[PDB]
């Protein structure tokens, strides 16, 4: 059950960010993965996302929910390094919370604290 960091080496990830930032300078590179213990949400179709740098976290969350085709009654949370602010621009989350490899990592679940 290998996560993205386990499938690609640290060097491969650093190199991937460098090139994708050079080719897509208006986009934030984001890794979005499902919580390993998740039991009721579907898995996403892909792992690596490019998010425009005028978008905020509230907007991203609604977009991902829609990708998963969730019913209104279904809980969804998006965690950036374990913390569950919706208004923050994804550029600012990136500057603050990006990994040493340069990706911004997120995990989604139907629980908010996990776990």
């Amino acid at each position: 059950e290998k996560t993205f960091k386990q499938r690609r080496t640290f060097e491969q990830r650093v190199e991937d960010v460098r090139l994708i930032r050079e080719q897509h300078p208006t986009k934030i590179p984001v890794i979005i993965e499902r919580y390993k213990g998740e039991k009721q949400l579907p898995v996403l179709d892909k792992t690596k996302f490019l998010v425009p740098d005028h978008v905020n976290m509230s907007e991203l969350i609604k977009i991902i929910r829609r990708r998963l085709q969730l019913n209104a009654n279904q809980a969804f949370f998006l965690l950036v390094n374990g913390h569950s602010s919706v208004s923050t621009p994804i550029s600012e989350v990136y500057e603050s919370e990006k990994d040493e490899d340069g990706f911004l990592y997120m995990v989604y679940a139907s629980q908010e604290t996990f776990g």
């Binding site: 499938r7 892909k46 792992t47 490019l50």
Partner: peptide, 12 residues
């Protein structure tokens, strides 16, 4: 997994 492609997210 398709680690070789990025989804390009845009506002609707």
């Amino acid at each position: 997994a398709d680690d070789g492609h990025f989804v390009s997210i845009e506002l609707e």
